[PDB]
Chains A and B, each alone.
Chain A
């Protein structure tokens, strides 16, 4: 009779579609209005551990400031250009000093502080706009980097394929959990201040996700199995298959409507402004995953198999050959 589950509270933080509510590989869960025009943006309530963007055919890394023709590189990355005074990038001590008169903000955890700090950058001199920029925090540097470019992928292999191919291309890139992003966290404007309690972080040693069925934790019924030499590789796989908000109808020669659809705001000449807009039977929501995807994996350290699945788990099985991992989780860290 009783149909409750004593696992419910413990497992809430693996109910990713609820706590996170957006894409993970690619997060463009919300739309905000800037100066009349509507743009897509990240909106994930949880930090994405390990995630960064890989720029294809460029030396330049993604936390290098965007191209303005000044100090960092030419072609540049995704980060806010230098400013006076410099709000980005900014260290932990530097942030805590800037917000020292604000009791709530000055005591935030490093990750929520960075998202909040980023939240303070005004889009295109629009004072009352809901549009806030995402950000990446680096635990080695202790540096919050504010992202000027909120798009996370553009690489249809018609232009992008060698790594740039033809005569007049501009930016090819994709989200990844590269080994060099291990200390990075991708932070949307919405990262909650209580993430370390409601969001995944560390992978679970000697644990396997399961389903609560008739007072019992049973195996996940339907999993897909991939080879994975180590936990990192299983995490990369889960992250590759996780909730995506990418326009899964990808274009060719990018039109302005398709530019915005990828989460582009500025073609840098000014703002990207659609004259016809999305119209008809579209809803405007056909690429909002709301956190729906293959967000979880059961890594078997013995068979080297990454058992990946798209239903939320509702208990844990004790099994010494397993590590339970999520697409939000740290690529490496185990508890």
Chain B
């Protein structure tokens, strides 16, 4: 499988809004869980985003898609965002399940500037 991430690039003004959509495409298993990662413009270190506050995730498990909406955009939001899919694995008995790290989108290069 692969994860279809849009948009590739975003140039936004401070205060505006951004939605990153991701879709799990040709995937044998279902979307079990999701994660979001970002490399800030300045760093080379991809880091875990903490969902909450202005960062709002919707997950559509039926249609194997998920999205991150960032509102009241700040310059500090600038960077490349990647979403990640996780699949499930049942041990041949149970009742414990086990996550598997799936595919990752190609990213969103977000630039946030103020007016001038």
With a cutoff of 8 Å between Cβ atoms, the chain A residues found around residue B33 in the complex are 127
Q: SS class of chain B's interface: helix, strand, loop or mixed?
A: strand
Asked if A84 is an interface residue, CB under 8 A from chain B, the answer is yes
- From B11-19, B62-70, B83-91, the one touching the partner chain is B83-91
Interface size on B, residues (CB 8 A): 21
- A122 close to B91 (CB less than 8 A): no
Scan residues 99-126 of chain A and give those whose CB is less than 8 A from a CB of chain B. 101-102, 119-122, 125
- Distance in angstroms between the alpha carbons of A185 and B101 in the assembled complex: 23
Asked if B41 is an interface residue, CB under 8 A from chain A, the answer is no
Asked if B98 is an interface residue, CB under 8 A from chain A, the answer is yes
Asked if B1 is an interface residue, CB under 8 A from chain A, the answer is yes
Number of A-B contacts (CB under 8 A): 51
Asked if A83 is an interface residue, CB under 8 A from chain B, the answer is yes
- A119 close to B101 (CB less than 8 A): yes
- B99 close to A85 (CB less than 8 A): no
Closest B-chain residue to A127, C-beta based?
A: B35
- A101 close to B26 (CB less than 8 A): yes
With a cutoff of 8 Å between Cβ atoms, the chain A residues found around residue B43 in the complex are none
- Distance in angstroms between the alpha carbons of A329 and B95 in the assembled complex: 42
Interface residues on A, range: 10 to 19
Complex partner residue of B1 from A68, A82, A85, A101, CB under 8 angstroms: A101
With a cutoff of 8 Å between Cβ atoms, the chain B residues found around residue A127 in the complex are 33, 35, 86, 99
With a cutoff of 8 Å between Cβ atoms, the chain A residues found around residue B28 in the complex are 85
With a cutoff of 8 Å between Cβ atoms, the chain B residues found around residue A87 in the complex are 89, 100
Contact code string B90-106 (vs A, CB < 8 Å = 1, else 0): 11110001111111000
Contact code string B53-71 (vs A, CB < 8 Å = 1, else 0): 0000000000000000000
A-B pairs, top 9 by smallest CB distance, nearest first, are A122-B99, A120-B101, A101-B2, A83-B89, A82-B92, A128-B48, A84-B90, A81-B91, A127-B35
Q: Which residues of A contact B (CB under 8 A)?
A: 68-71, 81-85, 87, 101-102, 119-122, 125, 127-128
